Amino acid sequence: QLTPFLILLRKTLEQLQEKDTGNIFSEPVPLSEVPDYLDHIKKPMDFFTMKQNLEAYRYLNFDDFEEDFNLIVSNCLKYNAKDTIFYRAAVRLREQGGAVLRQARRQAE
Numbered sequence: 001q002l003t004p005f006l007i008l009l010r011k012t013l014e015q016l017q018e019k020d021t022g023n024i025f026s027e028p029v030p031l032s033e034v035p036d037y038l039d040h041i042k043k044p045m046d047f048f049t050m051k052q053n054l055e056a057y058r059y060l061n062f063d064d065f066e067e068d069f070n071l072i073v074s075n076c077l078k079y080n081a082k083d084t085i086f087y088r089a090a091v092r093l094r095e096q097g098g099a100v101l102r103q104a105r106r107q108a109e
């Protein structure tokens with residue numbers, strides 16, 4: 001049901017954000033500091049934006065939620081060179097966030 005699902009997602013988002021130990025993915029990539037970001041990235045995403053989306057009832061299924069998480073990672077791997085803190089952090093988040101989502105999905109099913 002909807003209310004239990006939304007409770008699950010809120011907890012899941014909290015746990016995903018907990019894996020961002022560099023605090024690298026918790027606000028939008030700042031265009032004032034990374035001015036060419038939108039030359040390469042179609043749809044920016046970050047955990048604050050996901051929280052706004054969650055609280056506005058925009059994630060009513062697990063796939064839509066997981067897709068936005070996957071964008072946080074994919075965008076970062078795409079934009080940044082391999083030998084950067086950003087790329088390395090995204091690879092780690094993919095692994096550790098992946099684990100959180102697998103557990104959450106087992107709960108939702």
Ligand SMILES: COc1ccccc1C(=O)Nc1cc2c(cc1N1CCCCC1)n(C)c(=O)n2C
Nearest residue numbers: 023024025027028029030033034076079080086
């Ligand atoms: C607020 O961010 C900055 C402030 C001053 C100088 C530089 C930055 C900055 O480069 N931030 C930044 C760049 C990112 C980035 C994240 C950030 N910040 C780092 C500081 C906290 C907010 C997010 N991700 C995920 C990327 O792929 N890129 C290129």
